[PDB]
Design a protein around this ligand. Structure first.
Ligand code: FO7
Lengths: 109, 110
């Protein structure tokens, strides 16, 4: 059994969805080292069956400014998938970046 | 009976910078659904590194054709086998960075 903080991690993305920062907690949970994620779009990692739903959730984030993703799968580093729910927030300036608070719903499947 | 195919241009990173409207019949997406995205985003997880390595090599091959087969996720969320044939173009009157031209055909894996 894991405590809430240990299943949560933050990530930051450019408006093109590429990772620009990820907390080190992701490593224990999904296998990735943060620096290997950098410069790759979120889209590289969604299961095929979640892809279209994520595109619609992204539109909503861009029109509303904040969105909760609802349940999706991230490809894990050594294959299989982990279920996540994310709260996304756009940071706008003087859009600049997207901040994601990511909560793991499952082990690697 | 024609194969179903469409042309695209990419930057050296893999991002679609041009997409021929024959894509709608080939894979189901409007060109604007592909433009600005990296081709690897449409690629099966088992094939994504081969596709990244292929974009990386085609620029070393002196403008000659490099082919790759990979599973592409159609607009219906289904994996379609694609054979992408790619080569670089650089206009010798200039020193602008080369880009990659691809022809993308749905093929059988058998
Ligand atoms: O909730 S969103 O704002 C969103 C969700 C995830 C997102 O990125 C991640 C972050 C991760 F840690 C892992 C994976 Cl597979 C994707 C992103 Br970017 C968004 C914003 O669209 C919306 F698009 F779902």
């Amino acid at each position: 059994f894991k405590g809430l903080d240990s299943k949560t991690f933050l990530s930051e993305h450019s408006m093109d969805m590429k990772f620009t920062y990820c907390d080190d907690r992701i490593t224990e949970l999904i296998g990735y080292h943060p620096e290997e994620l950098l410069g790759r779009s979120a889209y590289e990692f969604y299961h095929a069956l979640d892809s279209e739903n994520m595109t619609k959730s992204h539109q909503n984030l861009c029109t509303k400014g904040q969105v909760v993703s609802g349940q999706y799968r991230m490809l894990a580093k050594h294959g299989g998938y982990v279920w996540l729910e994310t709260q996304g927030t756009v940071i706008y300036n003087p859009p600049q970046c997207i901040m994601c608070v990511n909560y793991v719903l499952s082990e690697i499947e | 009976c024609q194969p179903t195919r469409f042309i695209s241009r990419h930057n050296i990173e893999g991002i679609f910078t041009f997409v021929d409207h024959r894509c709608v019949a080939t894979v189901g997406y409007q060109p604007q659904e592909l433009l600005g995205k990296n081709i690897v985003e449409f690629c099966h997880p088992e094939d994504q590194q081969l596709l990244r390595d292929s974009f990386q090599q085609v620029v070393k091959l002196k403008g000659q054709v490099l082919s790759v087969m990979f599973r592409f996720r159609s607009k219906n969320q289904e994996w379609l086998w694609m054979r992408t044939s790619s080569f670089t173009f650089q206009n010798p009157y200039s020193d602008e960075i080369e880009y990659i031209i691809c022809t993308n055909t749905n093929v059988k894996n058998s």
